[PDB]
Structures are given as C-alpha cells and as structure tokens.
Ligand binder design. Structure first.
Ligand SMILES: *Cc1c(COP(=O)(O)O)cnc(C)c1O
Ligand SMILES: *Cc1c(COP(=O)(O)O)cnc(C)c1O
Lengths: 386, 387
C-alpha cells in the first residue's frame, strides 16, 4: 500500500541530505535527520489543495489544527490539556532559543545531557548562557543518567534551565517513567525550569513506549513544557511547523511574550496545513514505517556484528538513527571521517559535533529503503583498518 | 487579460486574517490587512503543485538559482547590483526588523521611526526595551514630508543608534525622492546611525513614481545601511514566508546573521524558497498588469470620495495599494469612527491610531481587489458619515 521500497529521487530538490551527491554522484548520504521515504499521500494532496486556494495570503492556526494536536497528544501519548496551552513555532530549534531567552538571563546556567543533538549546546553558547554538560553514562549498550553527578551539576552551577531530549538523540534512548520522575524531582528541589524536546516521541520502537514529561506527574507542568512536532514523525521538516505545550500560565505567557519580542510568532500556511493533515491521516503510515525501521535497524546491527565486530553499535530504543562507536580502531576523528567520506563514499554525522563523548563516533540514519541501508552498511565496513 | 484581476477568489474557507470576520457576518467587507483579493500569478500556483510532486518534504537549502533570481530582480527592477553573498533570507520582514533591533542596538538605546508608520515598527522597538523616537512627519500639499531640522534634533537629543526607514512609506504610500534619501543618509553618516530600509512595497510604486533603493543613492551608504524586501507584498504570497535582507557591509552582514542564528531564526520553509524564486522569475508581466488595475482603483476612489464625501481628506498614494483617509473634519472620536465603519457601514479598515498619534481619526483602505469590490467598499465608506 505505502511505498517504503523505492526512494524518491531528491537530487533536484536542493536537499541538505543529498547536496554533496549533486556534485559527487558516488556519495551516499545517511546523516541529517530526514527520510528517503515518500511522505503519506494525504499530505501530498493537502499541498495540491493549498495551491488550489489561488491566493496565498496571511493565515492563522485554525481550531481544527488545534484539535488535531490535542487529539494526537491524547490518543497517542495520554497527554490531556487545553487548546490555549498550544503555542505554534515554525520549528523546535527556534522554540529552544525562545525558551532560553524567556526563562534565563545572560550568564545563567543551562544544563544538557551530553552527548546530545548539537543545536542544544550551540543555542546555549550563542545566547551567552553558561553551558553545563551533564555527561551520560554508558552501561550495557544504553545511555543512563548519573543522578548523583546530575544533582552536583545543577547545584554547583545554579542551573536555571534544563534542556531534556526524550527520546534522547543520539543513541535513541527512550527514558523510563521512573528516570523522568527523578529528573523532575531534581528540578522541583533546585528550582529549575525544564524543556522537554520530544520531537522523536512518535518513533519509539521494539516495544519501548514514550512517556511525555508532564504525564509523569500532575505538578510537573508547574516547571516543565513539552516541545514536539509532526515533522520528524512524518518527514515534513520542509513545511516548518511545530509546537510547545505550556500548561502553566506564567511559563506560557513568558514564552509567548519572548516569541513576539523576537517576531517569531508567525507560521507559514503550509506549516499549518501539513501538520493538521499528518496527524489526521498518518497513524497507519506510521505503523507501517515503524515495521520498516525495526527491520533496517535489526539488519544493520547484525550486519555490523558479522562484518565489523570491533565496531560498537548502540541499538536504538527509538528514533531512526544509530550511534556508532569506532573507538576500538586506531583512528582520529579526522581520519575516521576522511576514511568514510573519501574512501567508503558514505556521509554520516560526525559524533564530535554532539560533544566530547561523541569523539570517534558517527550517527547513521536508517530511514531509507532496505536496499539503500544495505549499501550504506556495506560501505561503512568496507575500508575499516586493522 | 490573460490574468484574472476581475474576479476575487473565495477565501472564506482558508482561515485568512482578512476574511475572518466575514465568515461569521457575511455582510462584512474587509479592506484592512495588506494582502490582495486577486489570484496569484499562475506560475506560483504551478510551483506549489510541483513541490507536492517532490514527494518527500525534507530539509532544503536556498539554491544558487534562488540567490540569482533575487540578484537579477534587484538589478533589473531597482538598478541595485551586489553579490550573492550579500543576501540573507529571513522568513519575514517583521522578523528581520526584530533581528536588526537586537543586532544593532542594546537595551535602552534609541531607535527612530518616521511616524505615523506601519505599527510593527513601534511595537518591535518597544517590546525589545529600546527607546522609541517618533519623528513626526509633516503633511503638505497632500503628501508626507520629513522635517529635517526636527529629524536632526530627534537624532541628537536621543543619541539615536538605529533608524527604521519605510520606503515607500506605509501609510500614505510616499515614494521618497532620491534627494530626500540623500539628506537622510547624510544625517546617518554625521551622527553614526545605522539605517534599515524596509522596502517591502518597492515594486508597487505607481503614477510614474519610481522607487529609489537606499544604497543606490550613494556608493558609501552601504557602510551604514541595509535593505529589507520580499516577493510577498508584490505578488500576494505572504503565507509562503520568505523575504530577504541585502547587507553589503561585511560587519553589518555578520552582525545580522549572528543575531539571526542566536535566535534560531535562520531557517526558511521549502515553499518559502520556491515561491519567491518563481515569482521573481515569471512575475513581471503580472505585475505590469496589477499596477494598471491599482492605478484605476485608486483613481476611482479619489474621484468617488471627492464627489460623495468632499469633507473626507484623501492622501493619494504615490505607491503601495493602500490609501490613507483622514476623517478629522467629522465630529468623531476614534472609537465612534470605527463603530460607524464596522457596525453601520460593514467595512473593515485599519484603524489609523494603530500607526501613531498622527493617525487619530484616520483609517487605511486596501484597494488591491477587483474594481467591483472596491466600488462597493467606497460606497460603504461614504454611506454613513455624520453631518
Ligand atoms: C531534528 C531534531 C530537531 C529538529 O527540529 P526542527 O523542528 O526541524 O527545528 C529538534 N530536536 C531534536 C532532538 C532533533 O533531533
Ligand atoms: C506588510 C508589511 C510588512 C510585512 O512583512 P512580512 O514580511 O509579512 O513580515 C513589512 N513592512 C511593511 C512596511 C509592511 O507594510
């Protein structure tokens, strides 16, 4: 029914992902987090229906779009809230910057769990806030929080804001309810505001269940907000819409005020349309996708185990992204990436972008047809040094 | 012609700002917010269909083709030559204004506007905790003019750091002469002011009036000035969300781009990119046609008001599709003027007082609609005006 077998040709679309391939046709990309899968058919139709409006002027977020978000959140994540708790933002990374600027002052400390999505550290640093990197443990193939050190990091730096990634990118760690509750209790104790980046929430796999942060405790809304989107779930990043759910009146007003100060309050018409459409029609597409992602991940894990046993592979609990550790090889980061790029002809995300814990790591995107994922894994193991 | 300026597409199901009230009260005729009730040029519609047919709607970048289109537009239309590297895309011009305020001034510092002017000018200054300096425009012989003596006083007395210029000026539709802009630039050089020229209406000058892009006035002006513009007002594509800054000075360009990234306001949607390139590539004949329709609508309005409401003082635009109306000769308050227009005449105009104190007892009228709609709106405006 849905096509997860053939990858639409993207070379002519000015994509980030395929940019290098436009000049060097032998490069295969598997880095930036979008998919080489056709998007659900109803979004395509919604774009055609937009063209047929004939006039492309100024629009606002409808009651139907607000209801679609409420309905998705309740039905998928058991998170019940009011339409007025929703704030639309053209992207989640924009929302992170707005939250930093609203909820902290210059020089105050913002904590992250490293290694993590590079715009977290970037946005803190560029905003002239103190970055506190709470280093994740790695135990038995999974990231885990050191709660003793996390508390030390909060107290020793007077942390004002915690940027949480859940599911955590990279690694694809789907935090248990009990882990989130311990995090929230630290924030309550130490008077920390928390932003939960839950953009990957719909992509938990292998029986792992997303727990949205404010569902953990009814008091968590007093200090925490949730960011999510339809874009990673449904491969519609180019449509530019996302949302913050901010139930606390003071937090909500502060975020919205800062958004307006920055004139960052407006969203494109297709931004609105694609999100409403994706949530209304996307459940069966997403079910079918998850089966394909699980198969690609299982394939990659087994292939790597057989062809490059020295390569340490973190199996995701969610997301379509695999965190690869080349630390057992006699390499530098520069030699690793020259090797992958110039010899293997594959483009992966550089692990050192995610923090010092990502040195000698790469991140591999498996959201593409299995035939492409097979080729990418073959390239990755081809030229690894003895 | 080949192009439809005769029939207004039905926008009631599109969640537009402009027609929102009419969806509940179908008697209401809107003529306020600046988008048009004309079909967009066909090549844009086709390009949206072509985007759907990409099939995957992932992350995209601004192409060399888009960069070249913007360069070619500026050169061809406005005699403004610069490098592809001088272009900065921003999802809107109002976004760019806030980025510029944050980049080029610090909290507490003074930003100057010519009042009355586009309300987001004053809003963006105030909400950013900068000092607003409102240099009040003169009105002489039916046109806004700058009082240069007072403009200099306002800069000096307030240590003005940044001047937000509107050119063409909204409201009123004043298409500033090269010589006016020369004098403004000289003041900025003298007093060390950075100038942001909002030229979003630049393609919509009319009746022989020609837009003069700020940095074309003198080759040194880009040392302190930058230009904001867009395809969106010109081509009625505001919902596609793209615009640009032209920033030739390396320091100013880096400062703007840095603030933009600090704010994570550096990304633009795929249709943002596509619709702008398309409009600039194919839009010239459509714009020639639009401008004839706009001139005929404005001429109609001026003449109709002269006959039916000679007490109504009408500023004839030199550009833009917006007319500034002065009801000052009527025995009215602002609140009573707008209840009269909205509740009794069933027409929605922009409230003049939104633009500054100088706009008290004024309203702004949007005539970018088919002539028949414009005729009705004008009829309603004069229907209910008090003795
Ligand atoms: C991809 C990603 C984002 C991207 O957000 P935009 O909405 O495209 O700005 C945000 N957070 C994480 C953790 C991501 O992986
Ligand atoms: C309409 C208008 C804008 C609107 O800009 P966006 O690009 O839609 O943010 C900006 N400046 C002036 C003077 C306008 O009239």
């Amino acid at each position: 029914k849905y096509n997860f077998q053939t990858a639409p040709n993207r070379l002519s679309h000015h994509t980030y992902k395929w940019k290098e391939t436009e000049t060097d046709p032998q490069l295969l990309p598997a880095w930036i987090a979008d998919m080489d899968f056709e998007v659900m058919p109803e979004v395509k139709q919604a774009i055609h229906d937009y063209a047929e409006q004939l006039v492309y002027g100024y629009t606002y977020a409808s009651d139907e779009l607000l209801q679609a978000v409420l309905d998705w959140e309740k039905s998928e994540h058991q998170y019940s809230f009011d339409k007025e708790d929703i704030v639309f933002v053209e992207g989640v990374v924009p929302a992170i910057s707005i939250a930093i600027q609203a909820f902290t002052k210059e020089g105050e400390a913002v904590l992250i769990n490293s290694p993590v999505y590079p715009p977290f550290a970037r946005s803190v640093r560029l905003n002239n806030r103190k970055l506190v990197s709470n280093s994740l443990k790695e135990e038995n193939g999974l990231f885990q929080i050191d709660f003793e050190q996390l508390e030390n990091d909060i107290v020793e730096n007077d942390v004002k804001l915690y940027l949480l990634c859940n599911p955590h990118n990279p690694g694809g760690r789907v935090w248990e309810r009990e882990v989130l509750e311990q995090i929230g209790h630290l924030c309550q104790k130490h008077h920390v505001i928390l932003v939960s980046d839950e953009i990957h929430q719909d992509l938990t796999l292998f029986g792992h269940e997303h727990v949205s942060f404010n569902t953990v405790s009814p008091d968590f809304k007093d200090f925490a907000l949730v960011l999510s989107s339809a874009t990673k779930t449904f491969n519609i990043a180019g449509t530019k819409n996302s949302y913050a759910i901010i139930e606390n009146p003071t937090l909500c007003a502060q975020f919205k005020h800062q958004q307006l100060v920055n004139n960052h309050h407006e969203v494109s018409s297709l931004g609105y349309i694609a999100t409403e459409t994706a949530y209304r029609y996307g459940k069966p597409w997403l079910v079918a996708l998850k089966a394909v992602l699980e198969e690609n991940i299982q394939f990659a894990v087994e292939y790597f185990a057989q062809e490059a046993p020295r390569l340490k592979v973190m199996k995701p609990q969610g997301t379509y992204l695999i965190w690869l550790d080349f630390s057992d090889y006699g390499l530098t980061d520069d030699a690793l990436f020259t090797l992958l790029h110039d010899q293997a002809k594959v483009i992966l995300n550089r692990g050192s972008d995610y923090g010092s814990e990502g040195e000698l790591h790469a991140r591999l995107n498996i959201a593409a047809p299995k035939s492409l994922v097979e080729e990418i894994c073959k390239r990755i193991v081809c030229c690894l040094p003895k």
